Symmetry: D3
């Protein structure tokens, strides 16, 4: 047990899927995991562990923002022996040619935060994902007939940024999606030596204002989860 | 409703007390408020509205870190008409003379987050609280026989910081307590024209590694909620 | 004696009001103080010490800009035993709802300077005044029928700045007045463990370019100086 | 022609291998390509275009440092239709487990330069390689029996950095090798919408000041050239 | 008349000598100038205009610190048509081979201040002096039998800096002396197209805490003022 | 001897002229030098050593950009005993009055780079030249009938910069010319206690793209070379 996780060593698997919403963690456990048991709920941040096709896989929320997820990722890595972390979430798109429901693989993650600068003596630290985990995800995605876009994500600190012009800048450099924690998870991974990956589904477009229809929204969410779980399977063999 | 709050205009009172833990919000609502009704539950971020000495008071968690609490605070103001936001929580003390169970009123808040610079054209924005709210808290505390320490808090972005040297700097300029969102809340209030204040209690001492036992923890927390509540009543005249 | 102050320990009272202009210090000495004698004049910075209602009080100029006043405050603190510093001055207003002749109290102070960042390892240091000194000033004010505006001031490094847009940002973030040293004084106070406060009178509106007349200037100045002296007495009770 | 390249559009192939040294470019042209011809030489920066297994491929020196390689990469993309760019060079290792002769593939590239921040509104731009090109390079190496290391490189502006503590920070965050231009090339690629990748051989080890011998560097260099040329062929399939 | 100078157009000569102490201005006027009249005295900042060998010259204090001297210089250039400014002052040395009483001419001026960055889009602005004025100052010195040292000065915002480590860096890069306004003057000069220069005598040593004696100081001061005056004559040709 | 220069001790004169292009190095050596012998050719960076009017001098290219020239400069000073470096190149002019074919002497050098900040604890280092070398050049030019302009240059990192606005800020602050390495050389000269100077001729206007013929360029280039060479002889007196 750590200050933010009421669990003991062994209660978590070596790989953890982390959605933002703790309730999404509940859903994944009850929909894709077999014999899933609740391993944590300290601050309502539900966490579960179970088996997917015979492999033990844990699921837990990470809260909103880099500060939130950084805490949870550090403890899991340090006190629970977690080796691989896969974040599953949503992102908004700036690129017009990037449509809704598109699966985005965060090879790297640009950011608004200063976390990386504090760690890297105010130099540019490229927050990147693990090559093998990205590869596995790509291979697992196309196996399901889904075309995933491997590229740059943008981790924002402020969901409500006062700098509108930044969207134009993001588009010019081709960031695939803007979310709020990929870069942080990557910093934490590099610092404590673990492997990480962030997979997102474009839920809404900053330009062509439109969100996914609830039904299709949940369908694509499940496609993403399948992609994640399958990549893990593909990753240990 | 908002993308992070499943409530309607009118479901929230003009004053909202915000602890970090969703479960603490529920505790306050069920122990101090009368006829508390759940008004929010999207990501388990429980929100409740009730009564206190006739005064309509709301309580809701804000999560961990500046980016998390910033989203909720902004939505409560712009979408639910909240006028005053009072953060209740705990902090770590760095100064030798500051002891556990001390009540710290964050008149100002230092931070290593870049959210303020993004807003203030990369200059120094003194994230400060509302004066009358600070004063109201000192009056309520004094009436309760609880001596309060008014000063600067430090909102860290990384609970697990790689820069252990910063604690010395903090001590050097006498920061009363270290926590994770005061600066962001003060940043939001100033941007959207609201009033904010963060009250904290010393739960641990950075230097002399002291922690409050479970019993004291609950006791001091109660004293803190008591202070914030009476504070609001004082501010009505 | 110091390289900037030709006096010995005892020549200065424990509290010292500090106007910008040394000529204004001479004024206060002979208009408000009793038995006030000149204790310093090294660089024209006239310093005086006398009595107000039997309380020993000193008055000395601080020059224009943070680096200037930072020298005098530092020296008074460490070599002349000054406990409280109360800068009394003028400022310009950006907010339309802030009228000429208004007395603004600086609870916090933003700045274009880098001094704070040099001290605070490039982070965000909230340059704040002493709380007790703030309410004391506010109380003295109301005792004279004056309702002071308590908030953020902005200590500019450049009177003639090549950045006009900065005023707009100031307006949206509610800064009450633009002056040039509160931030520095607050930084010094925090570094050497002393208490400080800055009270200003709106001499002009930067937006609606309207200046206070020499007549109004006198009347408001007297009022402010009165407030500062009375607050001191309140702090002795 | 451009101000730095005396060639007509069409003289370069859609893919360009770029070593730091122009003489090494000539070496690759005469040693690995068939019917290679000199397509540029304005400043001794030799540029050749020839064929490899029937595929048209160009080779051109890029010079030392981000400013030098940035000029060339941009011009090739914008005025010569170059689609892919592969930098081949050496790098020094700082991690204990990264041995000499090891082939390092820069999936990402950290940096000392301010070029990225100048493009990215002073935020963190994660300079990354093209996922497909990285994958192809890994497979090409695998087929040849070479175990490639995929990860983060560090592009330094100062070969002789007065800051030696940086090497330890690099070691702490797992950078695989330090060179001088990958981050710049990746920045240009993202700005002008092209594909890039840098492959390096570990020729020196910062910690245990060990270096490769004349024989070791010639042989390992050719292995790298093969991996690059083969990764391209693999990319057309 | 300006917000800080009650003089009128024409009251100032095309060149002004600007010592730090307003009193030194008085001394210069009442020693090196004939028919000198007090054209300014507002904040005790004495400004006189006289004649030196038929050459009309003004002298005026500028206060201590970049913000102070920036105001006076700006107004003198913009409203009083002053074409050349010559700051005369003391400076502490850090280089061992620099001895007390030495005459240092600042061709350039490093700094801690953020004023330049605000002016230069956060880039590095080389705060330099006017060449001809430097060459003339060297010549005047030669004729007077003095060997002046031309190089970099360091204009510090903080006389009581929290980090003495910076002094080692200053030494490392051979800076001749540390004062508090050269960089601000040079910035204003460039911003408005005026010519400026700063001449300093080594009043003390940082490493070897040794201050110059008042006796030596007076004569040295006179030697420097003579240099600055002789140089003005050389520039008129 | 060094990893970037395959020459030996004594093979270089204590002074070295450095054009950007190594082909130019060859040109200068075969047009102005007597018995010039090739001393280095490693990366095609042609270095020569000869005699001009009895005085032994060297010429060597430095490549494009601060990083490249920083490498060569450091090695010449620390490993080959070079006492002074003169960079001979071209620069684009922003000021209207600065005409084509004019000779600009960089007394100081503003920059886009972060190298100086790395060396000067993130403060403003005034990248300046050796005064003596500057005045010798202006004199050599005057003797040749050319009135050189002495002021500030801007050493840019990006030849193809996305921020087109910087050109107006430069214009406002009077920079004489834009180029890519002066601030870097001056930085190395300061770190290793050597003397440097950069002379440039206006090849074209960044504003109105006025382009001069290769013939006029050739001629003007030679004038600059003659000035640089003569100044060296004057430097021996």
């Amino acid at each position: 047990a750590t200050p933010h996780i009421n669990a003991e060593m062994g209660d978590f698997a070596d790989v953890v899927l982390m959605p933002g919403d703790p309730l999404r963690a509940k859903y994944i456990a009850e929909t894709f995991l077999e014999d899933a048991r609740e391993v944590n709920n300290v601050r309502g941040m539900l966490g579960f562990t179970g088996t997917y096709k015979g492999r033990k896989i844990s699921v837990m929320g990470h809260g909103m923002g880099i500060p939130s997820c950084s805490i949870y990722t550090k403890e899991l890595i340090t006190d629970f022996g977690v080796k691989k972390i896969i974040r599953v979430g949503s992102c908004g798109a700036v690129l017009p040619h990037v449509k809704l429901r598109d699966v985005v693989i965060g090879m790297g993650a640009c950011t608004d935060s200063k976390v990386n600068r504090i760690r890297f003596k105010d130099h540019d630290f490229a927050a990147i994902a693990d090559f093998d985990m990205v590869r596995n995800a790509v291979d697992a995605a196309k196996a399901l007939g889904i075309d995933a876009r491997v590229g740059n994500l943008f981790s924002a600190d402020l969901f409500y940024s006062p700098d509108g012009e930044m969207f134009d800048v993001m588009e010019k450099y081709g960031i695939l999606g803007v979310e709020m924690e990929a870069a942080g998870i990557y910093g934490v991974a590099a610092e404590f030596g673990a492997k990480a990956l962030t997979i997102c589904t474009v839920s809404d477009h900053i330009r062509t204002h439109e969100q996914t229809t609830a039904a299709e929204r949940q369908t694509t969410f499940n496609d993403m989860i399948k992609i994640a779980l399958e990549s893990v399977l593909l990753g240990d063999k």
